[PDB]
Every structure is written in C-alpha cells, then in structure tokens.
Design a protein around this ligand. Structure first.
Ligand code: GDP
Length: 367
C-alpha cells in the first residue's frame, strides 16, 4: 500500500536514530549493482502497489527495513562505480556514513577492493563486508563447507588488514569486521540469499541447507529461507551508524569551519533546530520538474520556500519544492529534518558538491 509506505517514510524521517545513510562499493564485476538492485527489490520498494539497473547511477534509493521490532529508513546513496578515483568518488564517500564492501568469493580481495576500502575509511565511513557469488563456490568450484569457510576467513583477514592500515587511528581496531557478530555476511546477490551468524542463530538455518537447495536448483525456497535483503539489511542496521551517531565524529573531518560555532555544533550533533546546512550530491534535469538537486541535510530543517545561500556559486536562492525518496521515487515533503537525504527544486545554479545553507558559512568543498 502506497499511502502506508509514505506515512512510514514520514514517521521514520523524524527519528534520526532510525536512519542509515549508506553506499555499496566493489571491485568491477564483484556485485555492487546486483546487490543494490536486489536489496531494493527484496525490501519491496519497487512493487507495483507503491529491477535490473534501477539503482545504476541513482542519486538515492530508500528502503524500509524492520529489525528487532523497529523500522529503519535506509538510504542507498549513489557512489561512482568502475572508476579508480576522482572528485565524484570522494564526494560520494563524504555523503555516506556506512558502506557495504562487496567481495567476490571467487576472486577475493582485489586491488580495486583495496582502493574503495581506502577511499571509504579516509572519510570516516564505517564498513561491513558482504562476500558475494557463493553460489559459484558451491556449483562451479564444488568446494566443501570447510573449504568455503576457509575461503571466507582469508577474505576477512585481507579486509581487516586494510582496515587496520587505513582506518582513522581511533577505529583501526573497532571497525574490523568479524563473522561472529554479523559484520560479515556471505551469499549470492544474484540468487537473492545470504547468511550471517546472527541470522543463523535467530532462525536455526544452516549453511548446509542452503548448499542442498543450491545443488537441487530450488531457487525459490533458497531465497525465502535465507533472504538476501533480510540478512544484509539486518547487518546494515546493527553495524552501520545512524547520522546522529556518525556526525559526532565525521563532521570535524568533513568540514573545515569552526566546530565550536553554533552552526558547527548543529552539524556535529545533527540538530534539526540549528540553521539549515545541506550538501548537494547530485543534480539531474527532469523534463517536468526541472533541476532536481539531491543532497544531505547535515543540520537544521529544509523547507519548501526556504531562502538559502549557494556558498560555492555565491548566490542567494530559494528552495521551491522539497522531496524525500521512497524507494527510487521522489515524494513531496514540506519540511525534512537533519539526517535525511532530500531532493529539492529551485536551485538551478547549484553544482554537484554545493554547500547550501541558511547562513554564509565555509563550504564543505572548494568549488
Ligand atoms: N554467479 C553469480 N553471479 C553474480 C552474482 N552477483 C552478480 N553476478 C554477476 O556478475 C556480473 C557483475 O555483476 P554486477 O552486479 O553488475 O557487478 P558490479 O560491476 O560490481 O556492479 C553480472 O553478470 C552478474 O549477473 C552472484 O551472486 N552469483
């Protein structure tokens, strides 16, 4: 039901501890797009009452996920795929608080894997690990359960070596990933299943059941018994931070202004009562709506009709319509508080990376 989901989005956007702003990153062909598309589909966000390629270069897609009796609003924000480095990559890392690092079970950790882990960690983005294509270990390589667990262990050790080496000093140990606490999951994005220790504890489901169904070709039972979106989004909710948790340590890194100032404090503490500061992540031109700027609200509350400064472009402006994402769709909202990803009209002169603020402040980017 559409009206129900819209109400749910409004409910959760008002509670910053229920939000997760994330991205997904991977070496080429390891499964970023398949995971992205199938999480969105599995969470039921593109059902007719409300798949391949829908997330490709999508500014944001949101998913509502229930975890231990509470609903969460997960924003899967665009991160550039298949590129080594660039301003676009850095900018997208700065927009997300958590990242799912996807590693192919066959190739393992590859040079581009190391690059994306580095790039995320450099901006205080907390990682979790999803080991993909486990169907290939089962069917094509015909590995034993012990051989597969040993393969996972090696991947995990390689990832943690990168975290130890590249995480900000304070998080070199804290952000290591482990199978035991479910900050690692493994599965097949393509066949819509995954497992983790917390999921297996909760349900009693065992890897051998998944192996059996896989070899039998019972793909319907497979994806229902160990759903990709349940296992992976459970991991997102438990282990990736809310914007209010993340901004307390991310904002001094991200913004070069005076953290002790009122606006600095409002961003540090994700305060919806402070002056509004947002950063534009992406702009598209819609034939009907005109320029639509997607962005993250760091502080304050963004409103339809709100007068703002475009800091990099050096102009005063007025936001026309504010929107928020429901799956891939923009839905109108007249006011949206800090912590959220929004889409706004009225800022045609803005560029990607633009700092948009109620007061003249230091920009997040030199632009
Ligand atoms: N066997 C298998 N193939 C997969 C899986 N996930 C993705 N693929 C395939 O691997 C290729 C690359 O996937 P894609 O999601 O586009 O990778 P990306 O480049 O990281 O975005 C495509 O042919 C996918 O269908 C998986 O779990 N198992």
């Amino acid at each position: 039901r559409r009206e129900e989901m819209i109400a749910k989005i409004k409910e959760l956007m008002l509670q910053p501890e229920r939000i997760r702003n994330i991205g997904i990153a991977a070496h080429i062909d390891h499964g970023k797009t398949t995971l992205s598309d199938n999480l969105l589909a599995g969470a039921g966000m593109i059902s007719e009452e409300l798949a391949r390629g829908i997330t490709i270069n999508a500014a944001n897609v949101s998913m509502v996920h229930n975890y231990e009796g509470k609903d969460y609003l997960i924003n899967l924000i665009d991160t550039p795929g298949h590129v080594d480095f660039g301003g676009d990559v850095t900018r997208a890392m700065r927009a997300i608080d958590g990242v799912i690092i996807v590693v192919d079970a066959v190739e393992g950790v590859m040079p581009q894997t190391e690059t994306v882990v580095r790039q995320a960690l450099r901006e205080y983005v907390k990682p979790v690990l999803f080991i993909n294509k486990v169907d290939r270990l089962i069917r094509e390589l015909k590995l034993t359960p012990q051989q597969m667990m040993e393969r996972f262990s090696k991947i995990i050790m390689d990832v943690n070596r990168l975290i130890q080496r590249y995480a900000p000093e304070e998080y070199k140990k804290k952000w290591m990933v482990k199978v035991e606490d479910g900050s690692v999951a493994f599965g097949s994005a393509y066949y819509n299943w995954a497992l983790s220790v917390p999921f297996m504890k909760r349900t009693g489901v065992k890897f051998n059941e998944i192996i059996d169904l896989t070899l039998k070709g019972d793909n319907r039972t497979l994806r229902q018994k160990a759903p990709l979106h349940v296992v992976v989004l459970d991991m997102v909710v438990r282990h990736l931070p809310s914007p209010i948790e993340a901004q307390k340590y991310r904002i001094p890194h991200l913004w070069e202004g005076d953290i002790s100032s009122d606006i600095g404090q409002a961003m540090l503490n994700c305060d919806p009562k402070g002056k509004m500061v947002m950063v534009v992540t992406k702009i598209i031109i819609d034939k009907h709506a005109g320029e639509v700027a997607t962005g993250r609200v760091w502080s304050g509350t963004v409103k339809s009709g709100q007068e703002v400064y475009l800091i990099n472009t050096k102009r005063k402006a007025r936001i026309q319509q504010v929107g928020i994402y429901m799956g891939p769709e923009r839905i109108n909202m007249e006011a949206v508080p800090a912590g959220n990803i929004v889409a706004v009209t009225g800022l045609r002169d803005a560029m990607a990376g633009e700092t948009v603020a109620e007061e003249q402040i230091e920009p997040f980017e030199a632009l």
